[PDB]
Design a protein around this nucleic acid. Structure first.
Ligand SMILES: Nc1nc2c(ncn2[C@@H]2O[C@H](COP(=O)(O)OP(=O)(O)OP(=O)(O)O)[C@@H](O)[C@H]2O)c(=O)[nH]1
Ligand SMILES: [Mg+2]
Ligand SMILES: [Mg+2]
Lengths: 360, 81, 97, 271, 86, 74, 56
RNA sequence: GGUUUCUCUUCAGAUCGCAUAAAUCUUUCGCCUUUUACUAAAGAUUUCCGUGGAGAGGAACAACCCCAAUUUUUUGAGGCCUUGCUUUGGCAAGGCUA
């Protein structure tokens, strides 16, 4: 043993305020590599494999559109999650600026997840969460939609308690209202934040203000139909919270229609959502069909890029609270500040952390 | 939304310029833009009806008050039309 | 002084006793065992001398038909229960002390 | 020509339940931990043999310091199962060894008892969430009494549709079922190509059967492995069609007979 | 009724005269709801447009380039050139 | 639909409004409505003769609203 | 095409030839013999379609 | 302008055909007087049972009512005086208005 687009990539590199450097971390088998794979196929329609375990990290840099269309350049450091390989994570954790911690919906937090939130807060990065693998609550565990709410709330509160345990300053508490957490199913092509879901609600239905809407969904707000005005506790209807009735129950019904009643009720329900599908594409099996419908309805990936763009340092802002730790002097006279400029100019101070051997 | 409005919003952050309804020009970096064309620009250069050129910190103008808009050589690259 | 390993074992409800026995053979001291909220699984947290940690994972999985599964991390050192300097201690050279 | 079936989900559910007897009630793959093709390939390569697995003839056929018996600490004896879990760490001269490992996320699918209770239903089997913590938290909660209101067009995205039916619990059970049954459509296979009993002898602890049948288990596993190991791609193709070439001549005719009739014909002609 | 008449002049050369009277010569790569025009490599000519003139044809001309105008001032649209295949 | 001005971060800031007729004024933008009409206190109109004479709070008509440029760093 | 014969055609031919002892045939002797080379095909094709105990 | 079917021609599986048989050669191995028939490992190569791709024909059946004051089909952007300018043409500036 990209013609008119890599130039565009170059100009994006040159802006240095349209790029985000993020590390994709979490526990073992919690969804990272499949996230990345389905994502590169979103962009390109163009030892390990036998192991089923990733050993060494891999970086990807790709151009992603947000919920407004503005393209970004994304630096994604896909790490391994086996607690024995935490070495690789440290590497990414230096040369990146934020962390997307992938948590499992069915398991929650375990060893490596808490240890990685520790390693991430002690290196003063940004911290975002993707509660991934949510179908394991609907199809596998078979949970009433309200107890799905309970479990999601629990995971978020526990990760919140730990991130408070290792960090003194109550600068950030995570909850999807702030745009901290996506909800995901890597393989079933669904990733959404309250922002993205409320914008979907608006774009297909009437003109409702998606931002003020998204401020109302998570977290014990109820809604009374007659007044059409969300309230804190005052339904005695024995009804669900805004979250359940508006985001989960519709998602339960989407899935239950796809896997249960694919032959009879599915064309009707698909009409009621706006998705049209060929005869040929309704002859798929249930997993490819489910993923295809969910992709056709949920759009590509906006929840993630939205949450990240909204809470990434953007290396231009970036560098300054970093060279405290990285640099041995930090800022004294010449180079600390020069780097803090992050200007493509002069000093050229780079940090190399990995060496990927060429096969040959 | 239209293809031009999508290009304009996507041009946010890049270097752009515009020619207003009153005959004045304003270039700058992309600050903010929306589907209503209400354009916010920052650190721009401004050229009046005679040609007086000067600097502006940040400004926000209604959509209908702009006539044309010049973008960099990037946007030309949805090629389906 | 010798290092210790922190072990976290996911397991079905029944096979808890199984892992217990394994940890006994290897000087375990299982600390905690707790339900997983919203799951049919229990989580076990235990310590184990890194000496006896060799093959503990595969031993665990073999005895329980793959159902259980552990990861391990170094946690802290500790006093090994011997007297390092005693000439009155002779070592039978292949059986375990 | 009878390729390509497509079926309804009730069809599949009854078919499943009817074939339930000839089937494995395993749901995932970490049952076969050191009991898959790669574990056997490695064991065969190292000439060590796991408890219930096959045994093969050795692949090919003085002093060292590391085995100086004064310089070891023996707390746990190394045993062949470790030597096959980690081929390279635990073995000198590991050659033609396949490196097997898997911690495949234990799948948690709760078989129901009756079709009565709803599909989505907290099961007694699941551990109660009862998530407790401090005074839990408070939100960036944009309190009402300022304003907000939903234009009386929008609604829960589809509320004319019930959560479940008499077809969803079934439809989910069908999602983790053995290979033919977790499908909806495929090509049709030949009748000899369908082994009915493989999923049986591939199991791990027969636990109290006579030594007779355990030796039979191991020899069936051996045959299985040798099949998988010596697999050659087709590598070549010339495709004489004997019977189309025959039928195209002036000497062969065609018909439909009772099976038994052409059976008696073939035997008479042999004689 | 055919929905084709706009695309027929789409992707081809075009001379646009706004409510301002000037000429913008550019590729009609698309239109929008308001009649907005996003055409690249455009040329802004103000004096006249050259039509086989023995005197000259290049006067009071600048390169506007990617010009994205709002359809509030879209007045007259003609075909000034063919499409260059790049 | 009905997107209001991005004047949240711009609220409570001194800006000059240039609107039709060459109408140049200075005034503090503190709030407005979704039609892009403004409500600016401290309005001191900058007439052509150059004299800036204060008028106070009024309704900054977005109908002919041309542009507003603040005097702070928003 | 070549469409099907009636079954009685086969049945009559084979019951006629019987066991090739009557000299009235005496020429199909040679082909009868020469067809032995292919009888392991007839046997395989026959046994791979046997009628599967839910069928009569 | 499509499916099903039949026939005819032509090109491939690189993890397959979710199944899995025999043969040849070369080298060790075990049966033991000889050879076939065997053992059971490795390697190199073939045959057989199935499949795919492409194309040609031929066949059967589907089928020639309210609407605008920030972006265009309502918009009051109106005039002139003077000045300066430029070769006239024309450009800019202030005012008067009703
Ligand atoms: N049920 C379910 N499983 C998922 C989903 N997304 C990913 N998976 C799992 O993803 C696994 C694929 O490899 P990954 O787990 O993504 O790799 P990883 O998370 O980085 O783990 P390591 O590579 O060892 O660090 C499969 O085993 C699936 O179990 C999902 O949305 N639903
Ligand atoms: Mg991986
Ligand atoms: Mg002789």
């Amino acid at each position: 043993t990209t013609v008119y687009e890599m130039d565009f990539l170059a100009d994006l590199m040159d802006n240095s305020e349209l790029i985000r450097n993020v590390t994709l971390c979490g526990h073992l088998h919690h969804g990272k590599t499949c996230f990345v794979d389905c994502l590169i196929e979103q962009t390109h329609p163009e030892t390990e494999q036998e192991r089923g375990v990733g050993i060494k990290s891999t970086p990807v840099t790709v151009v992603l559109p947000d919920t407004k269309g503005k393209s970004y350049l994304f630096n994604i450091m896909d790490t391994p999650g086996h607690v024995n390989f935490s070495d690789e994570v440290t590497a990414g954790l230096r040369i990146s600026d934020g962390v997307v911690l992938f948590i499992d919906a069915a398991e929650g937090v375990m060893l490596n997840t808490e240890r990685l939130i520790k390693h991430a807060v002690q290196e003063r990065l940004a911290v975002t969460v993707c509660i991934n693998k949510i179908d394991r609550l609907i199809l596998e565990l078979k949970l009433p939609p309200t107890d799905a709410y309970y479990k999601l709330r629990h995971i978020v509160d526990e990760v919140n308690g730990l991130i408070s345990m290792y960090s003194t300053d109550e600068n950030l508490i995570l909850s999807p209202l702030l745009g901290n957490v996506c909800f995901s199913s890597s393989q079933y092509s669904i990733c959404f934040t309250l922002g993205s879901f409320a914008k979907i609600y608006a774009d297909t239905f009437g003109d409702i203000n998606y931002q003020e809407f998204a401020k109302r969904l998570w977290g014990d707000i109820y809604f009374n139909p007659k007044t059409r005005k969300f309230t804190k506790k005052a339904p005695t209807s024995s009804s669900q919270r805004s979250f359940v009735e508006f985001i989960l129950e519709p998602l339960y019904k989407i899935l239950a229609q796809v896997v249960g009643d694919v032959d009879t009720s599915l064309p009707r329900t698909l009409d009621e959502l706006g998705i049209h599908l060929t005869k040929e594409e309704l002859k798929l099996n249930i997993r490819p069909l489910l993923r295809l419908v969910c992709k056709k309805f949920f759009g590509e990936f906006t929840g993630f890029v939205d949450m990240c763009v909204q809470h990434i340092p953007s290396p231009k802002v970036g560098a300054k609270p970093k060279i405290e730790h990285t640099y041995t002097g930090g800022v004294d006279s010449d180079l600390g500040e020069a780097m803090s400029d992050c200007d493509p100019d002069g000093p050229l101070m780079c940090h190399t952390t990995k060496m990927y051997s060429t096969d040959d | 939304i239209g293809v031009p409005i999508k290009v304009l919003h996507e041009a946010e952050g890049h270097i752009v310029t515009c020619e207003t309804n009153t005959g004045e020009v304003y270039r700058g970096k992309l600050i903010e833009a929306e589907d209503n064309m209400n354009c916010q620009m920052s650190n721009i250069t401004v050229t009046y009806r005679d040609g007086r050129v000067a600097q502006l910190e940040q400004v926000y103008i209604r959509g209908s008050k702009i006539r044309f808009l010049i973008l960099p050589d990037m946007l030309k690259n949805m090629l389906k039309s | 002084m010798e290092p210790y390993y922190f072990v976290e074992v996911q397991a079905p409800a029944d096979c808890v006793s199984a892992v217990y026995t394994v940890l006994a053979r290897r000087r375990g001291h299982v600390t905690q065992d707790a339900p997983i909220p919203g799951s049919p699984l229990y989580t076990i947290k235990a310590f184990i001398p890194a000496i006896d940690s060799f093959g503990f994972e595969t031993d665990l999985r073999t005895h329980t038909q793959g159902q259980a599964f552990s990861l391990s991390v170094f946690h802290h050192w500790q006093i090994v229960p011997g007297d390092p300097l005693d000439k009155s201690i002779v070592i039978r050279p292949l059986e375990p002390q | 020509t009878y390729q390509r079936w497509q079926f309804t989900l009730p069809m599949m559910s009854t078919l499943y339940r009817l074939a339930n007897q000839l089937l494995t009630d395993l749901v995932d793959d970490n049952y076969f931990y050191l009991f898959d093709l790669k574990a056997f390939f490695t064991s065969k390569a190292l000439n060590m043999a796991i408890p219930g697995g096959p045994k093969f003839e050795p692949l090919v056929r003085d002093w060292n310091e590391f085995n100086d018996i004064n310089k070891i600490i023996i707390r746990q004896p190394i045993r062949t199962e470790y030597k096959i879990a980690f081929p390279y760490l635990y073995n000198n001269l590991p050659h033609h060894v396949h490196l097997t490992w898997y911690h495949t996320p234990n799948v948690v699918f709760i078989k129901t008892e009756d079709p009565d209770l709803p599909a989505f239903y907290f099961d007694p089997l699941i551990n109660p969430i009862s998530h407790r913590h401090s005074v839990k938290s408070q939100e960036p909660l944009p309190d009402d009494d300022e304003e907000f209101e939903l234009p009386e067009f929008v609604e829960p995205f589809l509320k004319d549709t019930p959560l479940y039916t008499d077809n969803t619990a079934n439809g989910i059970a069908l999602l983790w079922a053995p290979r033919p049954f977790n499908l909806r459509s495929g090509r049709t296979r030949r009748a000899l190509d369908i082994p009915l009993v493989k999923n049986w002898y591939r199991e791990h602890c027969p636990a109290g059967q006579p030594v007779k049948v355990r030796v039979s288990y191991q020899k069936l596993l051996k045959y299985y492995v040798l099949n998988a190991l010596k697999h050659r791609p087709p590598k070549a193709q010339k495709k004489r069609y004997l019977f189309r070439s025959f039928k195209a001549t002036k000497f062969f005719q065609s018909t439909k007979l009772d099976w038994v009739e052409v059976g008696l014909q073939v035997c008479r002609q042999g004689y | 009724g055919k929905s084709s008449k706009m695309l027929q002049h789409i992707d081809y050369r075009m001379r646009c005269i706004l409510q301002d009277g000037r000429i913008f010569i550019g590729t009609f790569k698309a239109f929008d709801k308001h009649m907005n025009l996003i055409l690249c490599d455009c040329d802004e000519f103000r004096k006249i447009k050259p039509k086989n003139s023995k005197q000259a044809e290049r006067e009071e001309k600048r390169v506007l380039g990617l010009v994205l105008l709002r359809g509030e001032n879209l007045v007259s649209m003609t075909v000034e050139g063919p499409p260059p295949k790049d | 639909k009905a997107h209001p001005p991005e004047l949240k971060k711009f609220m409570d800031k001194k800006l000059s409004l240039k609107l039709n007729g060459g109408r140049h004024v200075q005034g503090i933008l503190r709030g407005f409505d979704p039609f892009m009409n403004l409500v600016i206190d401290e309005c001191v109109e900058m007439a052509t003769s150059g004299q800036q004479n204060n008028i106070g709070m009024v309704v900054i008509r977005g109908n002919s609203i041309i542009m507003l440029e603040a005097l702070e760093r928003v | 095409q070549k469409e099907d014969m009636p079954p009685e055609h086969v049945r009559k031919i084979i019951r006629d030839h019987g066991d090739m002892t009557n000299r009235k045939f005496r020429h199909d002797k040679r082909v009868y013999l020469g067809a032995l080379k292919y009888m392991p095909h007839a046997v395989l094709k026959l046994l791979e379609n046997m009628p599967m105990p839910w069928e009569q």
